[PDB]
Amino acid sequence: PDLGCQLYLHIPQQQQEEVQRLLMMGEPAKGWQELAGHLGYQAEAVETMACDQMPAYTLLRNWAAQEGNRATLRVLEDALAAIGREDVVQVLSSPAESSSVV
């Protein structure tokens, strides 16, 4: 049961890499530009991070680094959820374990 509160930004390496790979999944995105602009990223910025190899990590890093606020991963899950990305949310927020043997 949920009584306390799992780690949002302090998520486990498993969940961390899981999301990073998800965004860069083999499947071609269907709205990368709209995302960059929507977030408020300049053409120079989007092109900068894009050039790198780890855009997911660089994006979240530069974000919290530049913002230096108390913003958490929730900012991404929400900003993205607005587009209607439930698939990624399901893979990232998979269901818990069961009691039965199988």
Token code pair at residue 13: 């390496």
- Identify whether the C-beta of residue 44 lies closer than 8 Å to the C-beta of residue 52: no
In terms of DSSP H, where are the helices of 7-73? 13-23, 32-39, 43-51, 55-67
The pair phi, psi for residue 3, each rounded to 5°, is -115, -45
CA 40 to chain CA centroid, nearest Å = 16
Q: Specify the experimental method.
A: NMR
Q: CA geometry: angle at 74 spanning 18 and 10, to 5°?
A: 60
| One-letter amino acid for residue 12 of the chain | P
For 41, left (φ over 0), alpha (ψ -120 to 50), or beta? beta
**Count of Cβ atoms closer than 10 Å to residue 94 Cβ:** 10
Q: Which domains does the chain have, with CATH numbers?
A: 1-102 (1.10.533.10)
